[PDB]
Structure formats: structure tokens, C-alpha cells
Design a binder for this molecule. Structure first.
Ligand SMILES: [Cl-]
Ligand SMILES: [Cl-]
Ligand SMILES: [Cl-]
Ligand SMILES: [Cl-]
Ligand code: NA
Ligand code: NA
Ligand SMILES: [Zn+2]
Ligand SMILES: [Zn+2]
Ligand SMILES: [Zn+2]
Ligand SMILES: [Zn+2]
Lengths: 21, 30, 30, 21, 21, 30, 30, 21
């Protein structure tokens, strides 16, 4: 879910901006 | 931006320079 | 006064491992 | 709600449990 | 109150010129 | 103004330097 | 003989500690 | 008064609470 998107593969500052309240 | 696999502790420290005064949470489960 | 901006990192540092499978829930406002 | 005590004071691997996810 | 503004961040004369009578 | 992150005798005393003979209230409470 | 201006910057010491968390009131007028 | 006694005379940290916030 949260990690596979950023950890397995790469993740971007915006793709990551959804992981904030 | 810096983009790589992001796992372990190294990531939990990422939302700290990107998330701001708002707040956050952490889910270890992939 | 104490700087949590710095101080917290060590802490926001610690929330991850000690938390494990659960992860944490932070709020940089209170 | 911990960030104001666990800063100038000391809490480790047993007191902070209170605020973890 | 005043702390979030002035101790956590820097406060200028007129920013606290509101804190008095 | 001396622009700084003031706390302790660094703060409230300074008010009486600028806040005048009117008075003041101290809210340590965030 | 009677320097409130000094009494005020010295007392202001004892005002903050005793009432550092409850805070305090002052009116230099008075 | 507050400016009368604590100044020509010293005050004890207990009575100090008489004039607190
Ligand atoms: Cl590694
Ligand atoms: Cl200091
Ligand atoms: Cl530090
Ligand atoms: Cl003096
Ligand atoms: Na590190
Ligand atoms: Na001093
Ligand atoms: Zn590593
Ligand atoms: Zn540090
Ligand atoms: Zn100091
Ligand atoms: Zn003095």
C-alpha cells in the first residue's frame, strides 16, 4: 500500500504528498 | 526530486521535510 | 526553550522501529 | 501531544508507547 | 498563546505590542 | 527590534522594556 | 529610595517563576 | 501595595502568589 509505491519501486514528491493527513 | 526504493527508517524521516506543520502518520505494512 | 524541530527528528526517528508492523500517527501541530 | 515533554525530558522504548500507531 | 509565535518562532516588537494593555 | 526566539528572562522582562507602564499578561501556555 | 522601574524588572523575575505556567498580570501604571 | 511593600521591603516567594495571573 503505502510502501510498495515508494519503496519497492521509486516514489515522487507528489506521489508521496498523499501520505499526509 | 530524489527517487529510489523507500523502506526501513530512512523513509519515515522523509515526510518530515516534505509534510510541513500539518501532521502525518506511518504505516510500515506494504 | 527547546527545539523539537531538531529534537523531534531523533524522536520521529524512533517512532518507526519501536512501532514495527503498526507504524505511528504524528501531528506537527500539537 | 508528546512533542512538548519528550523533547526536554526523557522517554524511551516504554513511555512513548502512549502515542504510537 | 505568545510562545508559538515568539519562542518557537521569532517575534518582532509590534508582534507583541499586542500582548500588553 | 532584537529579533530572536526568546524564552525565560529573555522574554517577559523585555515587555516591560517596550510594553510601557500599562501592564501585561503572560501566557506560557501554548 | 523607590525605583519601581528596577523593582519592576527584578520582581518580574519572581513573577515568571512562581507564575510561569499560570502566568501573571501586571500594570506598570499601578 | 504591590509596588509599595515588595520594593522598600523584600517579599517572600509565598506571598508572591497574591498578585499572580
Ligand atoms: Cl540500507
Ligand atoms: Cl538559554
Ligand atoms: Cl539537536
Ligand atoms: Cl537591579
Ligand atoms: Na539517520
Ligand atoms: Na537577568
Ligand atoms: Zn540504509
Ligand atoms: Zn539533533
Ligand atoms: Zn538563556
Ligand atoms: Zn537588576
Amino acid at each position: 500500500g503505502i510502501v510498495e509505491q515508494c519503496c519497492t519501486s521509486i516514489c515522487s514528491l507528489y506521489q508521496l504528498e498523499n501520505y499526509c493527513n | 526530486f530524489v527517487n529510489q526504493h523507500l523502506c526501513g527508517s530512512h523513509l519515515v524521516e522523509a515526510l518530515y521535510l516534505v509534510c510541513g506543520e500539518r501532521g502525518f502518520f506511518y504505516t510500515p505494512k506494504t
